[PDB]
PDB file of C-alpha atoms in Angstrom:
ATOM      1  CA  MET T   1      85.774 172.175 106.381  1.00 46.22           C
ATOM      2  CA  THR T   2      82.670 171.412 109.047  1.00 46.89           C
ATOM      3  CA  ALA T   3      81.397 168.676 110.423  1.00 46.21           C
ATOM      4  CA  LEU T   4      78.401 168.796 108.738  1.00 47.66           C
ATOM      5  CA  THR T   5      77.435 169.518 105.279  1.00 45.42           C
ATOM      6  CA  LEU T   6      73.648 171.601 105.163  1.00 44.93           C
ATOM      7  CA  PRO T   7      72.587 173.352 102.802  1.00 47.24           C
ATOM      8  CA  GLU T   8      72.444 177.174 102.873  1.00 46.83           C
ATOM      9  CA  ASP T   9      68.552 177.025 102.745  1.00 49.45           C
ATOM     10  CA  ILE T  10      68.545 174.203 105.824  1.00 51.88           C
ATOM     11  CA  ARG T  11      67.034 177.116 108.090  1.00 53.13           C
ATOM     12  CA  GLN T  12      64.105 177.926 104.904  1.00 54.00           C
ATOM     13  CA  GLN T  13      63.200 174.173 104.557  1.00 53.94           C
ATOM     14  CA  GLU T  14      59.336 172.871 106.873  1.00 51.84           C
ATOM     15  CA  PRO T  15      59.973 170.888 109.385  1.00 53.99           C
ATOM     16  CA  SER T  16      60.153 166.947 107.639  1.00 55.50           C
ATOM     17  CA  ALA T  17      62.380 168.418 105.310  1.00 54.69           C
ATOM     18  CA  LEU T  18      64.966 170.215 108.080  1.00 53.35           C
ATOM     19  CA  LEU T  19      64.628 167.105 110.480  1.00 51.94           C
ATOM     20  CA  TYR T  20      65.872 164.764 107.631  1.00 49.12           C
ATOM     21  CA  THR T  21      68.755 167.124 105.744  1.00 49.64           C
ATOM     22  CA  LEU T  22      70.037 167.922 109.911  1.00 48.73           C
ATOM     23  CA  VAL T  23      69.648 163.721 110.810  1.00 45.51           C
ATOM     24  CA  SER T  24      71.102 162.626 106.530  1.00 45.32           C
ATOM     25  CA  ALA T  25      73.911 165.544 107.952  1.00 44.04           C
ATOM     26  CA  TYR T  26      74.995 164.070 110.981  1.00 43.54           C
ATOM     27  CA  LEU T  27      75.244 160.202 109.888  1.00 42.56           C
ATOM     28  CA  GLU T  28      77.341 160.763 106.447  1.00 44.29           C
ATOM     29  CA  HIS T  29      79.971 162.778 109.318  1.00 45.89           C
ATOM     30  CA  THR T  30      79.476 159.554 111.712  1.00 46.14           C
ATOM     31  CA  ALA T  31      79.753 157.282 108.911  1.00 47.70           C
ATOM     32  CA  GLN T  32      82.692 159.232 107.438  1.00 46.43           C
ATOM     33  CA  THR T  33      85.134 159.269 111.113  1.00 46.75           C
ATOM     34  CA  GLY T  34      83.511 155.268 111.632  1.00 44.47           C
ATOM     35  CA  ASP T  35      81.401 156.128 114.630  1.00 43.83           C
ATOM     36  CA  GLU T  36      79.122 153.981 114.694  1.00 43.68           C
ATOM     37  CA  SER T  37      78.528 154.652 118.330  1.00 43.75           C
ATOM     38  CA  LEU T  38      77.270 158.360 117.114  1.00 46.17           C
ATOM     39  CA  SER T  39      79.615 159.910 119.796  1.00 43.88           C
ATOM     40  CA  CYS T  40      80.315 162.799 118.846  1.00 45.88           C
ATOM     41  CA  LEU T  41      76.086 163.387 118.319  1.00 50.74           C
ATOM     42  CA  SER T  42      74.404 164.792 122.038  1.00 51.34           C
ATOM     43  CA  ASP T  43      72.049 164.308 123.746  1.00 51.76           C
ATOM     44  CA  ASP T  44      69.630 166.140 121.630  1.00 48.12           C
ATOM     45  CA  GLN T  45      70.618 165.119 118.403  1.00 49.37           C
ATOM     46  CA  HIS T  46      69.724 161.440 119.266  1.00 47.97           C
ATOM     47  CA  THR T  47      66.179 162.574 120.556  1.00 47.70           C
ATOM     48  CA  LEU T  48      66.384 164.059 117.199  1.00 45.45           C
ATOM     49  CA  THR T  49      68.317 160.949 114.866  1.00 43.16           C
ATOM     50  CA  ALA T  50      65.245 158.727 117.059  1.00 47.62           C
ATOM     51  CA  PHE T  51      63.048 160.796 116.677  1.00 47.89           C
ATOM     52  CA  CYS T  52      63.244 160.839 112.086  1.00 50.00           C
ATOM     53  CA  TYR T  53      63.806 157.234 112.812  1.00 48.53           C
ATOM     54  CA  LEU T  54      60.944 156.470 114.129  1.00 48.27           C
ATOM     55  CA  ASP T  55      59.624 158.699 111.745  1.00 44.31           C
ATOM     56  CA  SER T  56      61.147 156.997 108.055  1.00 39.58           C
ATOM     57  CA  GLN T  57      60.017 153.391 109.402  1.00 38.48           C
ATOM     58  CA  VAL T  58      55.952 154.304 110.999  1.00 41.19           C
ATOM     59  CA  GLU T  59      55.422 156.239 107.289  1.00 43.13           C
ATOM     60  CA  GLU T  60      57.585 153.508 105.119  1.00 43.68           C
ATOM     61  CA  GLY T  61      55.827 150.142 106.972  1.00 44.39           C
ATOM     62  CA  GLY T  62      54.244 150.142 110.554  1.00 43.03           C
ATOM     63  CA  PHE T  63      55.605 150.057 113.813  1.00 42.28           C
ATOM     64  CA  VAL T  64      55.602 146.380 111.922  1.00 38.52           C
ATOM     65  CA  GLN T  65      58.453 147.630 109.474  1.00 40.83           C
ATOM     66  CA  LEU T  66      59.784 149.291 112.790  1.00 38.03           C
ATOM     67  CA  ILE T  67      59.814 145.991 114.357  1.00 35.43           C
ATOM     68  CA  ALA T  68      60.662 143.030 112.008  1.00 36.02           C
ATOM     69  CA  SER T  69      63.468 145.395 111.387  1.00 35.82           C
ATOM     70  CA  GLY T  70      65.141 145.551 114.993  1.00 35.87           C
ATOM     71  CA  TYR T  71      64.683 149.348 115.876  1.00 37.72           C
ATOM     72  CA  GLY T  72      62.452 148.079 118.888  1.00 40.73           C
ATOM     73  CA  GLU T  73      65.044 148.835 121.296  1.00 39.58           C
ATOM     74  CA  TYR T  74      66.150 151.480 120.293  1.00 38.23           C
ATOM     75  CA  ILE T  75      62.639 153.596 119.685  1.00 38.00           C
ATOM     76  CA  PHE T  76      60.819 151.539 122.666  1.00 37.08           C
ATOM     77  CA  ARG T  77      62.394 153.227 125.285  1.00 38.06           C
ATOM     78  CA  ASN T  78      62.039 155.921 127.912  1.00 38.33           C
ATOM     79  CA  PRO T  79      64.198 158.130 126.761  1.00 39.90           C
ATOM     80  CA  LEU T  80      63.108 159.360 123.051  1.00 41.75           C
ATOM     81  CA  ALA T  81      59.606 159.946 125.225  1.00 41.61           C
ATOM     82  CA  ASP T  82      60.993 162.102 127.996  1.00 42.46           C
ATOM     83  CA  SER T  83      62.842 164.074 125.621  1.00 40.66           C
ATOM     84  CA  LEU T  84      59.816 165.203 123.986  1.00 43.73           C
ATOM     85  CA  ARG T  85      57.951 165.547 127.002  1.00 47.11           C
ATOM     86  CA  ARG T  86      60.131 168.396 128.069  1.00 44.47           C
ATOM     87  CA  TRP T  87      60.090 169.637 124.805  1.00 44.66           C
ATOM     88  CA  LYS T  88      56.311 169.738 125.115  1.00 48.40           C
ATOM     89  CA  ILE T  89      56.394 167.496 122.978  1.00 43.45           C
ATOM     90  CA  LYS T  90      53.107 165.113 123.544  1.00 44.03           C
ATOM     91  CA  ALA T  91      51.321 163.461 121.079  1.00 44.16           C
ATOM     92  CA  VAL T  92      53.725 160.855 119.433  1.00 43.89           C
ATOM     93  CA  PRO T  93      55.083 159.986 122.916  1.00 42.81           C
ATOM     94  CA  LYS T  94      51.468 159.109 123.283  1.00 46.23           C
ATOM     95  CA  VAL T  95      51.248 157.474 120.027  1.00 44.78           C
ATOM     96  CA  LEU T  96      55.237 155.078 121.647  1.00 43.54           C
ATOM     97  CA  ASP T  97      53.522 154.067 125.212  1.00 47.17           C
ATOM     98  CA  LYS T  98      50.212 152.443 122.944  1.00 47.44           C
ATOM     99  CA  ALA T  99      52.167 150.766 120.919  1.00 47.57           C
ATOM    100  CA  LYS T 100      54.868 149.629 122.674  1.00 51.37           C
ATOM    101  CA  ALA T 101      52.100 147.529 125.028  1.00 52.19           C
ATOM    102  CA  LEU T 102      51.234 145.824 120.958  1.00 49.69           C
ATOM    103  CA  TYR T 103      55.604 144.997 120.991  1.00 52.08           C
ATOM    104  CA  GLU T 104      55.747 143.515 123.905  1.00 51.24           C
ATOM    105  CA  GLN T 105      52.900 141.154 123.032  1.00 51.00           C
ATOM    106  CA  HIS T 106      53.685 140.412 119.982  1.00 47.26           C
ATOM    107  CA  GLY T 107      56.584 142.111 118.260  1.00 46.30           C
ATOM    108  CA  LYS T 108      58.686 138.700 118.970  1.00 46.11           C
ATOM    109  CA  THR T 109      56.257 136.524 116.580  1.00 46.47           C
ATOM    110  CA  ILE T 110      56.537 139.247 114.218  1.00 46.21           C
ATOM    111  CA  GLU T 111      60.317 139.254 114.300  1.00 45.94           C
ATOM    112  CA  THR T 112      60.686 135.586 114.409  1.00 45.01           C
ATOM    113  CA  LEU T 113      57.909 135.022 111.024  1.00 43.39           C
ATOM    114  CA  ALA T 114      60.531 138.322 110.296  1.00 43.17           C
ATOM    115  CA  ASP T 115      63.239 136.558 110.559  1.00 41.43           C
ATOM    116  CA  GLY T 116      61.951 132.886 108.695  1.00 40.21           C
ATOM    117  CA  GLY T 117      61.331 135.434 106.036  1.00 36.33           C
ATOM    118  CA  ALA T 118      57.660 136.822 106.298  1.00 36.12           C
ATOM    119  CA  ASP T 119      57.790 139.730 104.622  1.00 35.25           C
ATOM    120  CA  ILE T 120      56.920 142.806 106.121  1.00 37.21           C
ATOM    121  CA  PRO T 121      53.477 144.261 103.887  1.00 37.07           C
ATOM    122  CA  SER T 122      52.453 140.089 105.292  1.00 37.69           C
ATOM    123  CA  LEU T 123      53.252 141.036 108.605  1.00 39.92           C
ATOM    124  CA  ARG T 124      51.098 144.215 109.154  1.00 39.50           C
ATOM    125  CA  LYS T 125      47.641 142.368 107.310  1.00 37.14           C
ATOM    126  CA  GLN T 126      48.820 139.401 110.380  1.00 37.81           C
ATOM    127  CA  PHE T 127      49.407 142.122 112.694  1.00 34.96           C
ATOM    128  CA  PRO T 128      46.932 144.674 112.484  1.00 34.54           C
ATOM    129  CA  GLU T 129      46.451 145.687 115.936  1.00 34.63           C
ATOM    130  CA  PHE T 130      49.166 148.258 114.783  1.00 33.49           C
ATOM    131  CA  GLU T 131      46.867 150.172 112.045  1.00 35.53           C
ATOM    132  CA  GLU T 132      44.783 152.220 115.610  1.00 35.75           C
ATOM    133  CA  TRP T 133      48.534 152.838 116.224  1.00 29.35           C
ATOM    134  CA  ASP T 134      50.735 153.604 112.368  1.00 27.82           C
ATOM    135  CA  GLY T 135      47.420 156.031 112.587  1.00 27.17           C
ATOM    136  CA  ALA T 136      47.543 157.567 116.047  1.00 28.86           C
ATOM    137  CA  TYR T 137      51.255 158.224 114.405  1.00 29.94           C
ATOM    138  CA  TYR T 138      50.055 159.859 111.182  1.00 32.27           C
ATOM    139  CA  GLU T 139      48.203 162.398 112.669  1.00 32.08           C
ATOM    140  CA  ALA T 140      50.697 163.535 116.190  1.00 31.62           C
ATOM    141  CA  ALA T 141      53.457 163.993 113.667  1.00 31.45           C
ATOM    142  CA  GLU T 142      52.344 166.606 111.511  1.00 32.16           C
ATOM    143  CA  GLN T 143      52.168 169.070 114.723  1.00 32.24           C
ATOM    144  CA  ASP T 144      54.258 167.366 116.538  1.00 32.54           C
ATOM    145  CA  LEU T 145      57.131 167.442 113.653  1.00 32.96           C
ATOM    146  CA  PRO T 146      56.348 170.974 113.625  1.00 29.53           C
ATOM    147  CA  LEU T 147      56.494 171.583 117.752  1.00 28.78           C
ATOM    148  CA  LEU T 148      60.282 169.704 116.728  1.00 28.25           C
ATOM    149  CA  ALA T 149      61.132 172.702 113.804  1.00 27.33           C
ATOM    150  CA  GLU T 150      60.556 175.131 116.774  1.00 26.42           C
ATOM    151  CA  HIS T 151      62.632 173.554 119.472  1.00 27.18           C
ATOM    152  CA  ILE T 152      65.092 173.436 116.472  1.00 28.37           C
ATOM    153  CA  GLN T 153      65.268 177.030 115.461  1.00 31.08           C
ATOM    154  CA  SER T 154      64.683 178.590 118.399  1.00 34.35           C
ATOM    155  CA  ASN T 155      68.141 176.684 120.071  1.00 37.29           C
ATOM    156  CA  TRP T 156      69.849 176.458 116.178  1.00 34.48           C
ATOM    157  CA  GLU T 157      73.627 176.359 117.791  1.00 35.03           C
ATOM    158  CA  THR T 158      72.567 173.325 119.178  1.00 34.03           C
ATOM    159  CA  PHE T 159      70.998 171.419 116.390  1.00 33.36           C
ATOM    160  CA  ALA T 160      73.391 172.546 113.260  1.00 33.92           C
ATOM    161  CA  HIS T 161      76.840 172.137 114.668  1.00 33.65           C
ATOM    162  CA  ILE T 162      79.138 169.305 116.144  1.00 34.32           C
ATOM    163  CA  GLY T 163      80.132 170.157 119.852  1.00 35.96           C
ATOM    164  CA  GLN T 164      77.762 172.974 120.860  1.00 35.70           C
ATOM    165  CA  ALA T 165      75.859 171.768 122.948  1.00 35.16           C
TER     166      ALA T 165
ATOM    167  CA  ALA P   1      77.670 155.673  95.172  1.00 32.94           C
ATOM    168  CA  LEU P   2      80.174 154.710  97.196  1.00 33.03           C
ATOM    169  CA  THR P   3      83.311 156.008  97.750  1.00 33.47           C
ATOM    170  CA  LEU P   4      87.237 153.596  99.129  1.00 31.49           C
ATOM    171  CA  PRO P   5      90.187 154.064  99.627  1.00 29.89           C
ATOM    172  CA  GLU P   6      92.203 154.396  96.173  1.00 26.62           C
ATOM    173  CA  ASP P   7      94.038 150.755  98.651  1.00 26.58           C
ATOM    174  CA  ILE P   8      91.356 149.560  99.121  1.00 25.37           C
ATOM    175  CA  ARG P   9      91.757 146.057  98.687  1.00 25.92           C
ATOM    176  CA  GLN P  10      95.370 146.116 101.386  1.00 25.68           C
ATOM    177  CA  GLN P  11      93.922 147.140 104.339  1.00 24.77           C
ATOM    178  CA  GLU P  12      93.833 144.709 107.009  1.00 23.13           C
ATOM    179  CA  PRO P  13      90.318 141.617 108.318  1.00 22.36           C
ATOM    180  CA  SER P  14      88.876 144.816 110.762  1.00 20.69           C
ATOM    181  CA  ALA P  15      89.743 147.936 108.378  1.00 18.92           C
ATOM    182  CA  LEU P  16      88.583 146.271 106.072  1.00 22.14           C
ATOM    183  CA  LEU P  17      85.432 145.750 107.202  1.00 21.35           C
ATOM    184  CA  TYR P  18      85.114 148.910 108.217  1.00 23.80           C
ATOM    185  CA  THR P  19      85.727 151.547 105.830  1.00 24.32           C
ATOM    186  CA  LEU P  20      83.366 149.064 103.237  1.00 25.01           C
ATOM    187  CA  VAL P  21      80.977 149.304 106.161  1.00 23.92           C
ATOM    188  CA  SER P  22      81.166 153.136 105.514  1.00 26.44           C
ATOM    189  CA  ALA P  23      80.766 153.332 103.016  1.00 28.59           C
ATOM    190  CA  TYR P  24      78.343 152.519 103.239  1.00 27.23           C
ATOM    191  CA  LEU P  25      76.525 154.518 105.237  1.00 26.17           C
ATOM    192  CA  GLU P  26      77.946 157.170 103.665  1.00 25.11           C
ATOM    193  CA  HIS P  27      75.883 156.623 100.967  1.00 26.67           C
ATOM    194  CA  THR P  28      73.171 155.973 102.236  1.00 26.06           C
ATOM    195  CA  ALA P  29      73.122 159.501 104.506  1.00 27.30           C
ATOM    196  CA  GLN P  30      73.438 161.768 101.757  1.00 27.14           C
ATOM    197  CA  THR P  31      70.715 159.890  99.811  1.00 25.95           C
ATOM    198  CA  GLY P  32      68.365 158.827 102.355  1.00 28.42           C
ATOM    199  CA  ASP P  33      68.108 156.070 102.371  1.00 30.74           C
ATOM    200  CA  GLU P  34      67.805 155.073 106.097  1.00 25.30           C
ATOM    201  CA  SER P  35      66.394 151.642 105.234  1.00 24.85           C
ATOM    202  CA  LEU P  36      69.393 150.512 103.886  1.00 20.77           C
ATOM    203  CA  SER P  37      67.350 149.638 100.659  1.00 23.52           C
ATOM    204  CA  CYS P  38      70.309 149.321  98.437  1.00 23.34           C
ATOM    205  CA  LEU P  39      72.419 147.215  99.681  1.00 22.81           C
ATOM    206  CA  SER P  40      72.410 144.031  99.264  1.00 21.15           C
ATOM    207  CA  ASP P  41      72.031 141.073 101.353  1.00 20.38           C
ATOM    208  CA  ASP P  42      75.605 139.908 101.525  1.00 18.05           C
ATOM    209  CA  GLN P  43      76.315 144.024 102.464  1.00 20.18           C
ATOM    210  CA  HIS P  44      73.384 143.324 105.347  1.00 21.04           C
ATOM    211  CA  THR P  45      75.697 141.041 106.419  1.00 19.92           C
ATOM    212  CA  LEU P  46      78.658 142.909 106.592  1.00 19.86           C
ATOM    213  CA  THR P  47      76.499 145.920 107.976  1.00 15.94           C
ATOM    214  CA  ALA P  48      75.601 143.735 110.938  1.00 14.47           C
ATOM    215  CA  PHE P  49      78.427 142.017 111.613  1.00 16.15           C
ATOM    216  CA  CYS P  50      81.280 145.722 112.127  1.00 13.60           C
ATOM    217  CA  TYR P  51      78.168 146.891 114.489  1.00 11.93           C
ATOM    218  CA  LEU P  52      78.345 143.474 115.987  1.00 13.99           C
ATOM    219  CA  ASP P  53      82.101 144.339 116.617  1.00 14.17           C
ATOM    220  CA  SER P  54      82.092 148.252 117.272  1.00 10.82           C
ATOM    221  CA  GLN P  55      79.829 147.806 120.744  1.00 12.37           C
ATOM    222  CA  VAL P  56      81.182 144.923 122.155  1.00 15.00           C
ATOM    223  CA  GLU P  57      85.317 145.726 121.193  1.00 15.52           C
ATOM    224  CA  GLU P  58      84.332 149.728 122.183  1.00 17.90           C
ATOM    225  CA  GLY P  59      81.659 148.437 125.773  1.00 16.40           C
ATOM    226  CA  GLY P  60      81.056 143.904 125.677  1.00 15.85           C
ATOM    227  CA  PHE P  61      77.268 142.729 125.444  1.00 14.13           C
ATOM    228  CA  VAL P  62      75.687 144.817 128.175  1.00 15.31           C
ATOM    229  CA  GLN P  63      76.760 148.106 125.560  1.00 13.35           C
ATOM    230  CA  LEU P  64      75.489 146.312 123.052  1.00 12.19           C
ATOM    231  CA  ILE P  65      72.138 145.571 124.487  1.00 11.57           C
ATOM    232  CA  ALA P  66      71.988 148.969 126.403  1.00 10.85           C
ATOM    233  CA  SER P  67      72.567 150.971 123.428  1.00 10.35           C
ATOM    234  CA  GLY P  68      69.309 149.166 121.692  1.00 10.96           C
ATOM    235  CA  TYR P  69      70.565 147.127 119.151  1.00  7.97           C
ATOM    236  CA  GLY P  70      69.380 144.143 120.442  1.00  6.58           C
ATOM    237  CA  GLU P  71      66.781 143.270 117.985  1.00  6.24           C
ATOM    238  CA  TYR P  72      69.177 143.833 115.081  1.00  4.35           C
ATOM    239  CA  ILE P  73      72.127 141.300 116.099  1.00  3.19           C
ATOM    240  CA  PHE P  74      70.933 138.562 117.933  1.00  2.00           C
ATOM    241  CA  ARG P  75      68.231 137.768 114.746  1.00  2.00           C
ATOM    242  CA  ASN P  76      69.086 134.603 112.533  1.00  2.00           C
ATOM    243  CA  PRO P  77      69.618 135.960 109.126  1.00  2.00           C
ATOM    244  CA  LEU P  78      73.930 137.433 110.080  1.00  2.00           C
ATOM    245  CA  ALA P  79      74.032 134.489 112.376  1.00  2.00           C
ATOM    246  CA  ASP P  80      73.228 132.048 109.704  1.00  2.00           C
ATOM    247  CA  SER P  81      74.104 134.498 107.159  1.00  2.00           C
ATOM    248  CA  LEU P  82      78.010 134.157 107.867  1.00  2.00           C
ATOM    249  CA  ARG P  83      77.349 130.691 108.279  1.00  2.00           C
ATOM    250  CA  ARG P  84      76.669 129.897 104.528  1.00  2.00           C
ATOM    251  CA  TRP P  85      80.082 131.228 104.230  1.00  2.00           C
ATOM    252  CA  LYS P  86      81.656 128.712 106.773  1.00  2.00           C
ATOM    253  CA  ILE P  87      82.376 131.497 109.805  1.00  2.00           C
ATOM    254  CA  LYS P  88      80.944 130.080 112.969  1.00  2.00           C
ATOM    255  CA  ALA P  89      82.727 130.750 115.512  1.00  2.00           C
ATOM    256  CA  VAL P  90      81.238 134.128 115.669  1.00  2.00           C
ATOM    257  CA  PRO P  91      77.906 132.164 115.451  1.00  2.00           C
ATOM    258  CA  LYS P  92      78.149 130.032 117.951  1.00  2.00           C
ATOM    259  CA  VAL P  93      78.770 133.240 120.314  1.00  2.00           C
ATOM    260  CA  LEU P  94      75.940 135.350 119.463  1.00  2.00           C
ATOM    261  CA  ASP P  95      73.220 132.439 120.021  1.00  2.00           C
ATOM    262  CA  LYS P  96      74.830 131.831 123.707  1.00  2.00           C
ATOM    263  CA  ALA P  97      74.798 135.120 124.153  1.00  2.00           C
ATOM    264  CA  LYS P  98      70.692 135.666 123.008  1.00  2.00           C
ATOM    265  CA  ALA P  99      70.522 133.348 125.467  1.00  2.00           C
ATOM    266  CA  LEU P 100      71.670 136.099 127.938  1.00  2.00           C
ATOM    267  CA  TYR P 101      69.761 138.800 125.942  1.00  2.00           C
ATOM    268  CA  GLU P 102      66.684 137.314 126.537  1.00  2.00           C
ATOM    269  CA  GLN P 103      67.670 136.468 130.678  1.00  2.00           C
ATOM    270  CA  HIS P 104      68.779 140.349 131.612  1.00  2.00           C
ATOM    271  CA  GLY P 105      68.675 142.211 128.485  1.00  2.00           C
ATOM    272  CA  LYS P 106      65.384 144.125 129.975  1.00  2.00           C
ATOM    273  CA  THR P 107      67.399 144.910 133.415  1.00  2.00           C
ATOM    274  CA  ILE P 108      70.193 146.351 130.815  1.00  2.00           C
ATOM    275  CA  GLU P 109      67.603 148.540 129.141  1.00  2.00           C
ATOM    276  CA  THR P 110      65.848 149.547 132.192  1.00  2.00           C
ATOM    277  CA  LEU P 111      68.993 150.578 134.390  1.00  2.00           C
ATOM    278  CA  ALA P 112      70.847 152.489 131.622  1.00  2.00           C
ATOM    279  CA  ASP P 113      67.647 154.271 130.632  1.00  2.00           C
ATOM    280  CA  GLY P 114      67.526 155.377 134.246  1.00  2.00           C
ATOM    281  CA  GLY P 115      71.329 156.959 134.076  1.00  2.00           C
ATOM    282  CA  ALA P 116      73.071 153.915 135.028  1.00  2.00           C
ATOM    283  CA  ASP P 117      76.485 154.246 132.976  1.00  2.00           C
ATOM    284  CA  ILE P 118      77.463 151.905 130.326  1.00  2.00           C
ATOM    285  CA  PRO P 119      80.999 150.645 132.432  1.00  2.00           C
ATOM    286  CA  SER P 120      78.480 150.177 135.500  1.00  2.00           C
ATOM    287  CA  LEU P 121      76.089 147.952 133.634  1.00  2.00           C
ATOM    288  CA  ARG P 122      78.789 146.363 131.983  1.00  2.00           C
ATOM    289  CA  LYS P 123      80.526 144.841 136.226  1.00  2.00           C
ATOM    290  CA  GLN P 124      76.444 144.706 137.738  1.00  2.00           C
ATOM    291  CA  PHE P 125      76.396 142.162 134.322  1.00  2.00           C
ATOM    292  CA  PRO P 126      79.663 140.264 134.719  1.00  2.00           C
ATOM    293  CA  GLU P 127      77.936 136.985 132.893  1.00  2.00           C
ATOM    294  CA  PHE P 128      78.363 138.439 129.087  1.00  2.00           C
ATOM    295  CA  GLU P 129      82.249 138.252 130.494  1.00  2.00           C
ATOM    296  CA  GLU P 130      82.540 134.929 129.083  1.00  2.00           C
ATOM    297  CA  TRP P 131      80.905 135.788 126.658  1.00  2.00           C
ATOM    298  CA  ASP P 132      82.720 139.855 125.608  1.00  2.00           C
ATOM    299  CA  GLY P 133      85.727 136.965 125.457  1.00  2.00           C
ATOM    300  CA  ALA P 134      84.609 133.935 122.937  1.00  2.00           C
ATOM    301  CA  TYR P 135      83.930 137.257 120.673  1.00  2.00           C
ATOM    302  CA  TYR P 136      86.979 138.812 120.675  1.00  2.00           C
ATOM    303  CA  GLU P 137      88.893 135.264 120.130  1.00  2.00           C
ATOM    304  CA  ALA P 138      85.673 133.939 117.807  1.00  2.00           C
ATOM    305  CA  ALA P 139      86.201 137.689 115.877  1.00  2.00           C
ATOM    306  CA  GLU P 140      89.885 137.417 115.412  1.00  2.00           C
ATOM    307  CA  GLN P 141      90.079 134.225 113.478  1.00  2.00           C
ATOM    308  CA  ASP P 142      85.803 134.717 111.826  1.00  2.00           C
ATOM    309  CA  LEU P 143      87.411 138.703 110.562  1.00  2.00           C
ATOM    310  CA  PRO P 144      90.402 137.073 108.356  1.00  2.00           C
ATOM    311  CA  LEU P 145      87.511 134.230 107.323  1.00  2.00           C
ATOM    312  CA  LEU P 146      85.521 137.315 106.015  1.00  2.00           C
ATOM    313  CA  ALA P 147      88.360 139.644 104.855  1.00  2.00           C
ATOM    314  CA  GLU P 148      89.308 136.101 102.619  1.00  2.00           C
ATOM    315  CA  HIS P 149      85.049 135.517 101.360  1.00  2.00           C
ATOM    316  CA  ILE P 150      84.757 139.865 100.080  1.00  2.00           C
ATOM    317  CA  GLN P 151      88.125 139.356  98.439  1.00  2.00           C
ATOM    318  CA  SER P 152      87.062 137.110  96.716  1.00  2.00           C
ATOM    319  CA  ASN P 153      83.759 138.698  96.187  1.00  2.00           C
ATOM    320  CA  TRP P 154      85.270 141.354  96.122  1.00  2.00           C
ATOM    321  CA  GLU P 155      82.133 143.520  93.000  1.00  2.00           C
ATOM    322  CA  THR P 156      79.577 142.280  95.273  1.00  2.00           C
ATOM    323  CA  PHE P 157      80.499 144.226  98.279  1.00  2.00           C
ATOM    324  CA  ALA P 158      82.601 146.788  96.518  1.00  2.00           C
ATOM    325  CA  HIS P 159      79.622 148.842  95.138  1.00  2.00           C
ATOM    326  CA  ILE P 160      76.004 148.882  94.933  1.00  2.00           C
ATOM    327  CA  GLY P 161      73.396 147.012  92.576  1.00  2.00           C
ATOM    328  CA  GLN P 162      76.182 144.660  91.541  1.00  2.00           C
TER     329      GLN P 162
END
């Protein structure tokens, strides 16, 4: 009956779990409806979704995985960093601007090599310039995921439903 | 893993593709598998073709680009995988559209980021109109070819891990 399938105890979850549970419920819903464009999500829900993809990819395999897998023109766009800054979340945006610059220099090569069968862990050693930024991301993330959680808890109706804000 | 209608294999070619990919995505949403690690290369080919088709049908190549799909769709694995399956018309459109993305994509994306609406951008970049129309013609033939390949290999496509 609701669009979103959320556990009873969702509001008690820690910041990373809360983000992933919400984004996962958004994506479950959009898969079920065929809404590939994510048209049912608000701008704020798109900010969460993008931050979650950022997080998952960098934690799994660095900015190099993010790039090689094809996320670069989704993540390295102003709406994500501008929306986080509006919520007074600044550290991850700073890291994104730094990483974007490296993406402009090396992204085409990373992607080309990936297309030809270079494995991502190997590419992460070939492009060690991103390591600094991977690490900066991990540092900025514990703080900024808690800020994000505070923002979500302050605006619960916006985030925990479709079509209410 | 996958929730499919009982009569899935009686669907017409676009509905089949969309229903399969939706089931993949429902599964991965439920498990948190955002990297789509559970999908085979062949299921990744279906998923990418689906996203190509949805974005182009909704709003042209310009929408595909504006929304951020360019480094997912304009990559060799999609086109190469299709050509292994003897599906050639969509790959040819992809390669032509990729060259236009390399020319115009940065501008389309920047303008979108600044608030330009996607229908307006599609008028601002009419270079893509030829290729939107070439994709609609290529996909009419190639989505049937894809459906015949999926029906020839059903268990590959209708399950995880097989």
